[PDB]
């Protein structure tokens, strides 16, 4: 009997008189709580279609909310979602997002959210209907719960779809999402808002836009928050944005928090914390100072020890040290701290196996920076940091005469470059020259690369200040190539190469 009224009500919804259409909409609205009448409207394509057309057309808000609410109730069942879907439900609902009447707006956004969640093919529908831009524009509202629903939709849509990301990007999404993170305290909201940003951060072109809005800073306010899922999202997001944001201001609090995050028991948080700092201290002196000033050096040291064999933690940690140990005020203070905190012995052990190139690559560079400090010369030597360092240079030079993501050329460079600084100490020169390094120190001058030549002359510059060393060089035949590098257009290569021959001139 109930199935006989439906084909009648349909007729009524289509009626012209907006006095009875309201009535029809009201009765239909009431026939949404009954498991029978619902499954009767639901299973009637002409009925559901009639409702959708009415909703978006009947400008009488009292009717628009009855119809919208009706569809809202159909979005709890698979057959309901399907009816809504195949009846052009999405495009209409998307259009209803422009309704100035909150009751209507809430029905739409909510139902849409259900559709996206459980109805397959709903994502394209919202995308095609200009839903992305309309949602991003709705990030102006101050309703924490409404924002939570809207931000989750965007995430669902943006996940796996590059175009959606580019769209959100162009819609000013980054600026809006950032404001939520730095305005609202509602966890659910903040959490789902981060998930959105996480999805956006993987996109190269989306990355900068986020950093400009002040994403780095905003994400750092919640690294302390109780919510595990919230923190674990800001870490993954920052580890993505990090490499880019080497120009930002007011990063202290963040840098500081990242430092003490290196202490968390959760090894996974320590991993991100280090990976992030490694990128923020890269060619950024202000970030290097800030880190050292909050005891960053000491922390990273502990991190390395606490890591151990696992190169997943040591790699980012070492790079961060490699950074903090040069080109700023507390550069010296940093080189001392690494020694003072008993980090020298362990670092050398990192050159030796079973370590890999990506690790060895960073370790050598750090040793170079640690050699700058005079009070590190002796300690480093004692740890056999010379025999093993050159040992790796020999194995690195053979592989270029005849990997793991690292080219052997720059490995050959890092070795010699470190030995340069690590030759200011007299005792060091003795060991260096006592391991027959001169013969191959000359072949480095025949290197096509300007970098290899630049350090190949600097090391011999330190060795040349001796007598028993200046002769072994000329006896090998290095007196000729040195004369050639005098003209090298490279500003650096032409500086040491000149001082080398000179040292052999005034004995």
């Amino acid at each position: 009997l109930a199935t006989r009224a439906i084909p009648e009500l349909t007729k009524l919804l289509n009626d012209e008189d907006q006095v009875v259409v309201n009535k029809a909409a009201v009765m239909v609205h009431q026939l949404s709580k009954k498991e029978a009448s619902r499954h009767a409207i639901m299973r009637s394509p002409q009925m559901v279609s009639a409702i959708v057309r009415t909703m978006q057309n009947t400008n009488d808000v009292e009717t628009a909310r009855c119809t919208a609410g009706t569809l809202h109730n159909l979005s709890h069942h698979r057959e309901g979602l399907l009816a809504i879907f195949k009846s052009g439900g999405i495009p209409a609902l998307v259009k209803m997002l422009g309704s100035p009447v909150d009751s209507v707006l809430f029905y739409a956004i909510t139902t849409l959210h259900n559709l996206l969640l459980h109805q397959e093919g709903a994502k394209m529908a919202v995308r095609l209907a200009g839903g992305l831009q309309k949602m991003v524009a709705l990030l102006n509202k101050t309703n924490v719960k409404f924002l939570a629903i809207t931000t989750d939709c965007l995430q669902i849509l943006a996940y796996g779809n590059q175009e959606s990301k580019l769209i959100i990007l162009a819609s000013g999404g980054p600026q809006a999402l950032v404001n939520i993170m730095r305005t609202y305290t509602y966890e659910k909201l903040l959490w789902t808002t981060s998930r959105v940003l996480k999805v956006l951060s993987v996109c190269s072109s989306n990355k900068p836009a986020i950093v400009e809005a002040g994403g780095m800073q905003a994400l750092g306010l919640h690294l302390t928050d109780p919510s595990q899922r919230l923190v674990q999202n800001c870490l993954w997001t920052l580890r993505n944005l990090s490499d880019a944001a080497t120009k930002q201001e007011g990063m202290e609090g963040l840098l500081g928090t990242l430092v003490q995050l290196l202490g968390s028991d959760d090894i996974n948080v320590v991993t991100c914390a280090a990976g992030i700092l490694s990128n923020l201290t890269c060619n950024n002196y202000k970030n290097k100072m800030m880190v050292c000033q909050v005891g960053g050096i000491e922390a990273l040291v502990r991190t390395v020890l606490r890591a151990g064999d696992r190169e997943d933690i040591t790699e980012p940690a070492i790079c961060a040290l490699r950074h903090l140990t040069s080109r700023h005020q507390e550069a010296e203070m940093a080189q001392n701290a690494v020694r003072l905190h008993y980090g020298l012995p362990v670092v050398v052990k990192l050159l030796h196996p079973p370590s890999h190139w990506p690790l060895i690559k960073a370790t050598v560079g750090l040793i170079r920076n640690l050699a700058l400090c005079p009070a590190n010369h002796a300690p480093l030597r004692e740890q056999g940091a010379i025999p093993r360092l050159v040992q790796l240079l020999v194995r690195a030079h053979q592989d270029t005469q005849r990997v793991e993501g690292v080219r052997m050329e720059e490995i050959v460079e890092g070795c010699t470059g470190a030995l340069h600084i690590l030759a200011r100490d007299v005792h060091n020169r003795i060991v260096i020259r006592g391991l027959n390094t001169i013969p191959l120190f000359v072949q480095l001058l025949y290197s096509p690369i300007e970098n290899i030549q630049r350090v190949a002359a600097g090391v011999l510059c330190e060795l040349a200040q001796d007598k028993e060393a200046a002769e072994a060089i000329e006896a090998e035949g290095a007196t000729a190539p040195l004369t050639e590098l005098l003209h090298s257009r490279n500003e650096g290569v032409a500086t040491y190469a000149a001082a080398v021959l000179f040292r052999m001139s005034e004995d």
Binding site: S103, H113, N143, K145, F146
Partner: peptide, 15 residues
Amino acid sequence: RWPQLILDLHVRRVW
């Protein structure tokens, strides 16, 4: 609690 209602019963349904 209107029309806030609408969002609150929905949140419960999902989150």
